[PDB]
Amino acid sequence: VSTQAITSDERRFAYAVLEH
Amino acid sequence: VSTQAITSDERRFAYAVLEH
Amino acid sequence: TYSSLLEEFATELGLEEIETNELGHGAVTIDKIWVVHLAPINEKELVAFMRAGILTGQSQLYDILRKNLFSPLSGVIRCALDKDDHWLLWSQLNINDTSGTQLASVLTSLVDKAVTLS
Amino acid sequence: TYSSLLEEFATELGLEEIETNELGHGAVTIDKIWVVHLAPINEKELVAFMRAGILTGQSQLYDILRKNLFSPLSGVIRCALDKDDHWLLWSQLNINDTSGTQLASVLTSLVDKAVTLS
Incomplete structure (x- = not known):
């Protein structure tokens, strides 16, 4: 993996x- | 569940x- | 325990004792029409699965895809298509986490979802 | 350990330390374009996931459905559709079974599959 935060x-x- | 073997x-x- | 799991599923359902081959693959017939295959798949886990027949016509596709999300819960039912374009449904379960009565429960869900697609 | 897992994923990737909210939800940006969300989902497990954009046109549907089978292996990538018809991809992983370098691995797979759908 190549990139960040x-x-x-x-x-x-x-x-x-995260509920759907 | 209703039926058998x-x-x-x-x-x-x-x-x-079981591989596909 | 995969064999102790099938030992207990057989009980919570009074059935002789589920015959498995050398890959522990077994099968059960339901409402006389549905065959549910059971098989250990990993060291930790089993699969319960079955064939359900043809794709409506189209666009039950989107509807399954819209529901193919992750879940906090075990026993969720997932749908694929066949080489020959039949629904295949399956659930995968931690063999140690799963009582004989959870399994029967998954199977009922399996058979509900097929009835609804079919 | 969910926090020890992110502690180690951050290492195998020299990144400051991944900020999570109170639901341990965190995010990473990849090749500057892709946001990968990370979140504990159960007691045993996490989800890594992301948005990938619109459904070709149609019939990548069948192709995902034909590959939405169960697997012996962890880290498999699954695809859903959005309310607003974007691919959502995700994988769910046992938090104790998963090294920081397995996780990076899932993310790369996540981002491969998006590139291919997009």
Whole structure:
């Protein structure tokens, strides 16, 4: 694996898939 | 679960899915 | 224990004793129409699975894909297609975590989902 | 150990230390374009997952469904669709069975499969 550490509008898209 | 024990042409279809 | 698991599934279902081959592969018939195959797959785990027949026509595809997410829970039912385009459904279970009555439970779910696709 | 797993994945990848919230949810960015979400999901297990963008047009559906079979092996990549019809890919892994370098391995597979669908 080639790259590194962060996030944005997914502690939205994420937060949610994490129940859906 | 309602019914019980046996098989036929799947020790074929089975035998195979078991690698596919 | 894979054999102790089948020893107990046979009990919680009064059935003679499930005959396995040398790969511990066994089978059960359900409502006379459904064959459920059981097989150890790893050291830790088994698979229960079955054939369910043809793809509607199309687009039950999206609906399965939309539900093919991960789960916190064991015994989830997953669907694939066949070489010859029949639904195949299966669940994989930790053999030590799984009572004979969890297994019967998975099978019922297996057979529910097939009835619904078929 | 979920936190010891991320402690070691961070190492085998020299990255500061992966910040998690209170649900241990963390994220990594890959080739600058791909966000991989990591999250404990059970007591025994984690999920690694990500968004990959739109369904070709159709019929990569069958192709995923034809490959959505069970496996003896850990780290298999599974695909779902989004509410808004983007591929979501994920793998679920036993947290005790999984080294920091297995995890990097899953992520690479995750990102391979997305590149191929996208």
